Design a protein around this ligand. Structure first.
Ligand SMILES: O=P(O)(O)OC[C@H]1O[C@H](OP(=O)(O)OP(=O)(O)O)[C@H](O)[C@@H]1O
Ligand SMILES: O=P(O)(O)OC[C@H]1O[C@H](OP(=O)(O)OP(=O)(O)O)[C@H](O)[C@@H]1O
Ligand SMILES: NC(=O)c1ccccc1
Ligand SMILES: NC(=O)c1ccccc1
Ligand code: BEF
Ligand code: BEF
Ligand SMILES: [Mg+2]
Ligand SMILES: [Mg+2]
Ligand SMILES: [Mg+2]
Ligand SMILES: [Mg+2]
Lengths: 464, 464
């Protein structure tokens, strides 16, 4: 990895475009006006990519050679990079202040600020815009996952009177559905801010290396079938496949995909009659988890529940909702996103089924079908020093008021009613609003303040 | 990186679920039934993740300890992985056959097959499903980027009579808007299959290392401003910023973002009057490229062109379309995806503006707003040998015939009309359709067949 080659190409030319006599460029990130966002993932980027000796003679030469060919021209700021190598032994003269990881912040507030600590390095602040803005991704996954947690909490509480098992109700299925190995780990770690169930193994190492937990691992799985393990037995032998698998995993929870040929027949005839004796004997700690995986997600869940409620003893919980026996549960892992998850839990409640009966698995919906535009994540220059005088800078495009940026030096505060406000134009220095919530997390090549994964989960909790 | 920890958790339990005495699992990838897809990116995966000694005593021990805690149990196949280390020096006993990279193949055809080459490693075929399925991402970037080229080609030909400079008409802006560094390199490389203009630098090194080009680099950029480099001058000095920047880059193309406060004023008054003398003196090889960046994409482009058409000497080309002078162009890089790209060029044609006048930048729409479901990318077991008997396997869910999978040993063929057909159930062996078009690209830890980025580009060309 070479930080000199990890920026937008045009940024290589910006050192020639800023006003002459500029000693400071100060910039910030917001989720510009999903009304509150979980701030998570910066600490990964600081440690992986930004800290320590990030400039060498060799990286400067490599970048010089690449850009000469890429631009067909000599624009690369070799002198500038060489200055960092010589003066700071290749450590970035940059200060970053950030809201603590896990904090839940309303849209349109400063989440982090970036400035150069040496007047020579005025061009560096926005050099690293590209890498820092990629923080949009763990923010958005963390945020969208917690929004699904809110829906789940709401309906579980209404239909059952409590929140037991909430943290295992949305399982990460997204390893194959994301764009790379690196994305898989980052995305999976972001979902684990809110939940404990994951099949995206990549998230575990990332958390362990960059954040840390008191517990051995941040996330858990159970044995589960896929279509190749059912279909390999041949179409006439689905029953043999189910029997083999549940007997193999007789003492732990086991998920068994049941829609290879006909989900309704598998529920009613195979699980519900032929193998019923191998199900009713299971423990509460080792249920059979039937997994439908096709058809309209709502229609299918409701029909599976209807089938099972006719073949197995249903109870009615204290809220008046129907409950399968403890040895039997359902996971819907197909077509799951925040919209369809809401549609399913609502349709269930309508039909008097407890949300206790159901869990969800989500791949693409959870980890891939998200953009930097969902929370309008943007990084803008708001303050510069030119000729030793500070000036408040911003954009305000005529045809789009929603692209207006903030002015001057920024700080984030609690309001008297306990909300948040971002103070502009260095007004936080007036101290009318208690103390700035942004803390220095990076300064001059060093990570200066870290958060464990345990503190992040605590910060990101739901109210209730 | 540890391949033992690079699969969906459930697959760790699958070796216990297959029928007893299974010696072969054979699987395949297709873009299940955007009618044609560019096959690109498997070779990156083969080289980075799968080839060579990918199993060591330490990776086995690492995986063992992680899974013990992740499953709260001993499920991990320590013995099977030890067998691979001991028998093959940690090289994967796997054969992969694939269509050549760059090939443009209709939906619902076999793209690659995977099978184990040791009866003991029947469980390994689908172990590596997760990692290979991520090939969806470069396939989908390459395909959607090629779909945009087809639109650009059609309107450029229609408005101008030729395709000159088509390869620079869609510029990659998506580095900040993807989910990771790795993703950035992968997606940017996929875009470079069709085009030559990129600001995502990460794409260059990936191509150079994994594919190779004749040319020093596969992609090019030009100097361009961002809002920080305009706004840093102060709102009253937008002219000084513009003058400084074009004068710094007087002899190369320069892109100047012009919407910081008022795009229409910037075009009509600042570029069209105050700084006009510095524009009309520029070379054809060094145009000013005005970049609007807000407002309704189509309405803004038309209005911008209308403004410039009144301030600068417009000609009419040989097709009857209006053309700006050669020292002046426009690039629209806000809100660009394949739908809005189509709307703008069509709206331009309607107003008699040559597509020669315009280029596009795209970030999220190009590299991030895409999922594994856009081309329905799926990997399925189609053939197993159990007790020495080969059997053709598939799924066919009742409520979704679009999830039906293919049966048996597969091959890809030309039809007599020169189209593509995928033959099932070993029927390729009958020789009635000529030769299988898949080639062995990986076998037993070695990459056995390879393509340069130049062969890939040539394979991925448009018919035009
Ligand atoms: O939320 P998603 O990204 O869809 O991931 C979840 C789906 O992924 C797996 O199957 P896959 O989609 O690989 O195959 P299928 O379409 O044939 O079920 C799984 O069985 C779910 O169906
Ligand atoms: O296609 P996209 O992924 O949107 O990327 C392209 C956009 O990104 C950059 O600005 P940015 O979006 O960072 O800030 P802005 O929204 O204030 O223009 C660029 O100036 C384009 O507007
Ligand atoms: N455990 C599962 O059911 C699963 C399915 C697909 C992808 C990931 C996990
Ligand atoms: N060169 C550009 O205008 C650009 C803008 C945004 C991101 C990348 C590149
Ligand atoms: F494992 Be199945 F084809 F979703
Ligand atoms: F660089 Be601008 F804020 F799109
Ligand atoms: Mg599935
Ligand atoms: Mg934007
Ligand atoms: Mg912009
Ligand atoms: Mg699917």
């Amino acid at each position: 990895f070479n930080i000199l080659l990890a920026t937008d190409s045009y940024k290589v030319t910006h050192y020639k475009q800023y006003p002459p006599n500029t000693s400071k460029v100060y910039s910030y990130f917001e989720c510009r006006e999903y009304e509150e966002t979980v701030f998570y993932g910066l600490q990964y980027i600081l440690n992986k990519y930004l800290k320590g000796k990030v400039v060498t003679k060799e990286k400067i030469q490599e970048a010089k050679d690449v850009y000469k060919e890429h631009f067909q021209d000599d624009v690369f700021n070799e002198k500038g990079w060489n200055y960092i190598l010589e003066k700071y032994d290749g450590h970035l003269p940059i200060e970053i202040k950030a809201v603590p990881e896990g904090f839940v912040i309303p849209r349109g507030n400063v989440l982090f600020t970036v400035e150069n600590t040496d007047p020579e390095c005025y061009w560096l602040t926005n050099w690293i815009e590209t890498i820092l803005v990629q923080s949009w991704y763990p923010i958005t996954v963390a945020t969208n996952s917690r929004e699904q947690k809110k829906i789940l909490a709401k309906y579980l509480l209404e239909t059952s009177g409590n929140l037991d098992g909430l943290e295992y109700k949305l399982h990460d299925f997204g390893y194959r559905g994301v764009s790379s190995q690196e994305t898989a780990g980052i995305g999976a770690s972001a979902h684990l801010v809110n939940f404990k169930g994951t099949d995206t193994v990549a998230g575990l190492a990332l958390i362990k290396k960059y954040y840390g937990t008191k517990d051995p691992v941040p996330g858990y799985s159970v044995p589960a079938a896929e279509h190749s393990t059912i279909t390999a037995w041949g179409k006439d032998h689905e029953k043999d496949a189910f029997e083999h698998i549940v007997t193999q995993f007789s003492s732990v929870p086991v998920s068994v995909v049941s829609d290879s040929y006909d989900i309704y027949n598998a529920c009613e005839k195979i699980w519900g009659e032929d193998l019923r004796h191998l199900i009713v004997s299971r423990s509460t700690q080792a249920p059979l988890i039937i997994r439908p995986d096709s058809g309209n997600p709502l229609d299918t869940v409701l029909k599976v529940l209807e089938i099972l409620g006719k073949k197995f003893p249903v109870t009615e919980n204290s809220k008046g909702y129907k409950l399968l026996p403890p040895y039997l549960r359902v996971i819907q892992g197909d077509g799951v996103d925040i919209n369809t998850l809401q549609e399913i839990v609502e349709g269930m409640k309508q039909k008097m089924w407890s949300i206790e009966n159901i869990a969800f698995g989500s791949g693409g919906g959870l980890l891939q079908k998200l953009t930097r535009d969902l929370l309008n994540c943007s990084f803008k220059c708001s303050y510069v020093v030119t000729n030793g005088l500070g000036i408040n800078v911003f954009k305000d495009p005529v045809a789009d008021p929603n692209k207006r940026s903030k002015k001057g030096r920024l700080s984030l505060h609690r309001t008297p009613a306990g909300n948040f406000v971002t103070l502009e134009e260095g007004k936080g220095d007036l101290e009318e609003y208690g103390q700035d919530l942004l803390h220095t997390v990076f300064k001059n090549g060093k990570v200066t303040k870290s958060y464990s994964f345990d503190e992040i989960r605590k910060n990101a909790q739901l109210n209730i």
